[PDB]
């Protein structure tokens, strides 16, 4: 028969889904369960193009499209299949839940989660010890209540919870290869409570992947929390290659009763476009957070970075940082690359430039403010202005032991202006007559 209205189990004895699955009700649902544990080697499962839909109005229980359990590796062949978890309820609707301790490779598939009342999550990684998850050509579309900041999560990777802190260490290796997150963010979180919780996520976004859209920016959210004797470390190693990301990146660290909590975000962006803002946020005396942002191989970043945590930005290989709002970092390094500050001021502690380029708007007051040591060589450009340039605007300010060499020319009214170092060490555009 074409459609099962009963839940289906796939396992070593039945690796093929052979009908659509459509479950409706007012109770908990798991429409399809993949049990890997009796597989002698890996398990290879095919959905045969069939769709899977779980819809429930249950308020305080879970709605799941697919659940993957057991302890063997599985490959899920989901090409042309749509896996849906939906229906209005307080508890989260999740298109696919993974508590298997084995690897999970997903080939294709469209994972959809909808919940207008509570949260919706595309894929949740819930193995106690962490999972390897690979998405090849997969699509995720999570739409919860937008009244909630965390309401729509494409990929949810949390260790621990409020009831029981997470005691131990876990690594989730998450790869998006030519995959598309249409809606929902990515959350990589450890809630240690009073335990010692250590969570490392290696998030690889590669080979033509897309997150969000210009008018639909998502959030990549990394968070660590702990209390008292507890301790929490959240590492997010975010590698982006040949891809397009419309997403903020948040590092949040939340400590109570002097528990040490650290959120370390390490971003490498290669041949990619990233549109979105980076933030650090520390709550509590012993909370620390950091952002290490490196653009290489002709990458473009359009966004801003701020927060009370530590942030470092490095650009190489003709990369561009197009600054969209006031930004503050500890350190900015530019090699054969461009920072465009036509629209906003960058504040940095240190600055190092090697064949670097600064784009300014000579008619604005958007400047490069370096509080500490600036070094190297920088070319400064501005489009011509119909109006004269303010010769008292320090378009580059430096701190001490600064050895930066900065040059450039622009046009203001009928005059040429030359970037000139003043007696104060800062750089100003000076009318050349
Ligand atoms: Ca932006
Ligand atoms: Cl606890
Ligand atoms: Na099969």
Author numbering: 40 to 472
Can you provide the manuscript's text about this entry?
The αUpaB crystal structure was solved to 1.9 Å resolution (crystallographic Rfactor of 17.5%; Rfree 21.8%). The structure was solved from a xenon derivative by single isomorphous replacement with anomalous scattering. The crystal structure of αUpaB exhibited a right-handed three-stranded β-helix consisting of 13 turns, with each triangular turn containing three faces, F1, F2 and F3 faces. The interior of the β-helix is packed mostly by long stacks of aliphatic residues, whereas the exterior is largely acidic in nature. At the C-terminus of the β-helix, αUpaB forms a two-stranded β-sandwich that is capped by a three-stranded β-meander motif. However, the most striking feature of the αUpaB β-helix is the extended β-strands within turns 6–10, which reach up to 32 Å in length. The β-strand extensions contributed by turns 6–10 and the long loops protruding between turns 2–6 form a long hydrophilic groove 11 Å wide and 12.5 Å deep on the F1 face of αUpaB. Indeed, we identified electron density associated with the αUpaB lysine pair likely to be a bound calcium. Similar to other lyases, this calcium ion would be held in place by the neighbouring αUpaB Glu 314 and Asn 316 residues. Substitution of residues D116, D119, N146, N175, D217, K245, D246, D281, R310 and D336 on the F2 face to alanine (αUpaB_S1) caused almost complete loss of FN binding as determined by ELISA, while maintaining the correct secondary structure of αUpaB_S1 based on circular dichroism spectroscopic analysis and displaying a behaviour in solution similar that of the native protein. This result mapped the FN-binding site to a ladder of charged/polar residues that are contributed from β-strands or loops in consecutive rungs of the αUpaB β-helix.
Autotransporters (ATs) are the largest group of outer membrane and secreted proteins in bacteria and play important roles in virulence, including promoting adhesion. UpaB is an AT that mediates UPEC adherence to extracellular matrix (ECM) proteins and enhances UPEC colonisation of the urinary tract. UpaB is composed of an N-terminal signal sequence (residues 1–37), an α-domain (residues 38–500) and a β-domain (residues 501–776). Here we determine the structure of UpaB at high resolution and reveal that it adopts a unique architecture potentially comprising two distinct binding sites.
